Structure 1
Amino acid sequence: MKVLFLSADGFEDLELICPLHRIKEEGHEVYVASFERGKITGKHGYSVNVDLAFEEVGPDEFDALVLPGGRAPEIVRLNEKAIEITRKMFEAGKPVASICHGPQILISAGVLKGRKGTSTITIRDDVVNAGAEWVNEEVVVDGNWVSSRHPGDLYAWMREFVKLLK
């Protein structure tokens, strides 16, 4: 599988880096995208290399999407390309995994009407106002959409997501 992560500076470090390694473990290719190639820096000061700019991504290329949290989703969600990439991969029924603030991107993509998932509770209202049903669970699986709340949930988030790549 080719697996795509969308992020930017201020990502929650664990929420990006642990899944990155978890997926490589399976021998999948992982690609990190952001505003531009280079490096991004997390809330806790870890860096990661960006493989692709949003501009250069063909949604079709990629088999699955990941949307980690932190502050990054607040600026990612303003990017038209990132929104398109997200809308397309999600409406195609490809596996999409979000955590924490990740769903801010899904909101801005307009894809949540009549879906069910979770998020950090601090944006619950905003998820509800996007027409999704919010629940408070460590992981939710709603067809292709696999969603968790915070870093404590990682093990369960990834337990369920890797199932979807098999």
Structure 2
Amino acid sequence: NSRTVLILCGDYMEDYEVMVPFQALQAFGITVHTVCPGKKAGDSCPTAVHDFCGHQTYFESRGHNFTLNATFDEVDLSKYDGLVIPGGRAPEYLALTASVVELVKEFSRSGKPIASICHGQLILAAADTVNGRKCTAYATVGPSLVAAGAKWVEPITPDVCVVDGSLITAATYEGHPEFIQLFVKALGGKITGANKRILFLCGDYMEDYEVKVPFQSLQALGCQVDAVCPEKKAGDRCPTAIHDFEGDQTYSEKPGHTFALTTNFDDLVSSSYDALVIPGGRAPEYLALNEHVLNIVKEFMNSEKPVASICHGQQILAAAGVLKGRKCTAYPAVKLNVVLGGGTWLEPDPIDRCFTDGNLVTGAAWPGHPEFVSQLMALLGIQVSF
């Protein structure tokens, strides 16, 4: 009934490509270990934000530091049911690290599932494990996979995934939902109950992980997931903020990935949605002022549909007056808004704790994604069974 999965990490792997699988898979009940050659449990890796700005290739800036939870030197490969390889700029050097090539060789000859995304596939080409195997990758990776005897599948769109028995591949983090889903299925997983429409209340400078990880995690299960922002329409984008904890008395801020909205705020019917999700960051403080944002929250809470809100997301719940006589957590500073909103505080120590009060699920910040999503799934009647 359970699984354990290894993620092969390195310096400047793409932030989304490690974090989404890492937390979506934990949310689904699987144990996940992260390793990097040369590093031990509790070391960190810098990450890359790869995005487009209309140049002929992607731009890069720094993402959240990513703290490993395991020690590469001590990994016993027989304890793992599958392997995940994030993209970004880590694979190109990990592909030349003898200890990584050996690990990947060994894991591939066991026949266990390997899910590899974007530049990840370079490590597979170096390990010579793709001969006669069908696979996609970031388009610039295709020549090397071709030269390694792969059956290359040109990614006609950025969300393309390929499955070839135990080999799962994707081109970019845009393919995360099908990529993760195909990997869960490869592990023997069966997903039930995912026929749900979910709405995300987004805004500018919401937190980069706190929108993308729950959004993709729920898509991977099979949910129809929509993202709205007042005054914007489908295909408009929201800048995002990366909040990290770099030793000051509060978090740091830098730009994250831009995030594509999918539907029109004015067009929305709340009745057609099964649940609401509220990312944190700096959008909730201003969304908390929009009446139509408050009306939507009031409708869900009234009708006892699941509402999941994380971190600063609870500022909109408090301002809507829907926290009265309710129990919830939030970012520690947002305890002010919870208590002032008539709510009872649940203490987020450690900061990845999440809580359920009837139809309301709350978390405190991005480390809490596994619990946040898991507890949302329980309210939605979604199960992953092995």
Matched, 1:144 2:341: no
2:211 match: 16
SS of corresponding position for 1:20: helix
Q: How far apart in 2 are the matches of 1:125 and 1:21?
A: 30
Establish whether residue 33 from structure 1 lines up as the match of residue 228 from structure 2: yes
Q: Give 3-state SS (helix, strand or coil) of 1:125's partner.
A: helix
Q: Which has the higher contact order (CA 8 A, sep 6+)?
A: 1
CA distance, structure 2, for counterparts of residue 59 and residue 160 of structure 1:
22
> Which residue of 88, 106, 122 maps to 2:333?
122
Counterpart Cα distance in 1 of 2:337 and 2:299: 21
1:14 is matched by which residue type in structure 2? Y
Q: What TM-score does the superposition give when structure 1 sets the normalisation length?
A: 0.96
Shift of 1:143: 0.2
Gapped regions of structure 1 (runs ≥ 5)? none
Q: What aligned pairs does 1:1-166 form with structure 2 within 5 A after superposition?
A: 1-35=196-230, 36-37=232-233, 38-43=236-241, 44-137=255-348, 138-166=353-381
SS at match of 2:199: strand
1:20 and 1:30 in contact (8 A); partners too:
yes
Deviation of 1:56 (Å): 2.1
Structure whose CA Rg is larger: 2
Which is helix-richer, 1 or 2? 1
Aligned mates of 1:73, 1:53 — CA distance in 2: 18
* Deviation, structure 1 residue 112: 1.0
2:190 paired residue number:
none
Read off the aligned partner of 2:240 and give its amino acid letter.
G
Return the offset for 1:46: 0.6
Amino acid at match of 1:102: G
User: Which consecutive residues of structure 2, in runs of 5 or more, have no partner in the other structure?
Assistant: 1-195, 242-254, 382-386
**CA deviation string 1:79-119 (max 9, x = no partner):** 11111011101111000001100011101111111000000
Give the TM-score taking structure 2 as reference length: 0.42
Segment of structure 1 superposing worse, 91-100 or 55-64: 55-64
Q: CA deviation at 1:53?
A: 3.4
Distance 1:164 1:34 in 2: 25
Aligned length: 166
SS of the residue aligned with 1:164?
helix
CA deviation map 1:28-69 (0-9, x unaligned) = 100000021200110132111112233221111111000010
Partners of 1:56 and 1:122 in 2: CA distance: 34
Give the root-mean-square deviation of aligned CA atoms.
1.0
